[PDB]
Amino acid sequence: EVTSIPTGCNALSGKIMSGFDANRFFTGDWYLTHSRDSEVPVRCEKYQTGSNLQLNFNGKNGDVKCSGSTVSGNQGFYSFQCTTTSGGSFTSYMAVVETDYANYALLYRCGLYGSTTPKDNFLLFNRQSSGEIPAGLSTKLNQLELTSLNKLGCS
Numbered sequence: 001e002v003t004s005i006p007t008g009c010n011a012l013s014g015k016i017m018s019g020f021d022a023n024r025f026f027t028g029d030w031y032l033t034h035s036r037d038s039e040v041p042v043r044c045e046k047y048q049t050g051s052n053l054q055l056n057f058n059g060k061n062g063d064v065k066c067s068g069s070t071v072s073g074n075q076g077f078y079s080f081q082c083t084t085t086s087g088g089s090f091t092s093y094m095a096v097v098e099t100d101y102a103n104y105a106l107l108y109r110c111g112l113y114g115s116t117t118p119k120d121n122f123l124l125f126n127r128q129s130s131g132e133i134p135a136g137l138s139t140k141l142n143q144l145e146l147t148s149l150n151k152l153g154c155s
């Protein structure tokens, strides 16, 4: 039924890497090490991936389990249906902006989470918990005006 990302989310047309390879991105673990907007206290979320766009991460209050699917109307975007250990449920949308698969991935995430106003973010994932801001993203970050990503709770 849902064939495009929520109204107000940034489709980022023209700003996403060419040739995104889902096969190489949705494997292994991804640490969420930095983000444009951040909460307090900062934490270290490890995103564990599995086949068929499944993922697990250690969320704000308990493990979170998500099942993904492509969004037909928006190239590069995925919809995740997530459930939480406290019994909650939500939908979240994401696109991989840039990645080298082996080290870092810059993502865009957006959702309504029950509101009419979207909450979004730019997220930097690393394969190591000690990962920081890669030299290779320098110009791309400048272009997106992401000049000062907040470091989170991983080291």
Ligand SMILES: CCCCC/C=C\C\C=C/C=C/C=C/C[C@@H](O)CCCC(=O)O
Residues within 6 Å of the ligand: 030, 035, 047, 055, 066, 080, 082, 092, 093, 094, 109, 110, 111, 113, 119, 120, 121, 125
């Ligand atoms: C391997 C990376 C996979 C990323 C998957 C993207 C989305 C589904 C997973 C988690 C979604 C979390 C939703 C939290 C919403 C809210 O707390 C976030 C505020 C803004 C933001 O950080 O996106």
Ligand SMILES: N[C@@H](CCC(=O)N[C@@H](CS)C(=O)NCC(=O)O)C(=O)O
Residues within 6 Å of the ligand: 058, 059, 060, 061, 064, 084, 088, 089, 090, 113, 114
């Ligand atoms: N604000 C709404 C929606 C909150 C919501 O859906 N939160 C989701 C996404 S922020 C969640 O439980 N996330 C858990 C996590 O990210 O660890 C409510 O309180 O009912």
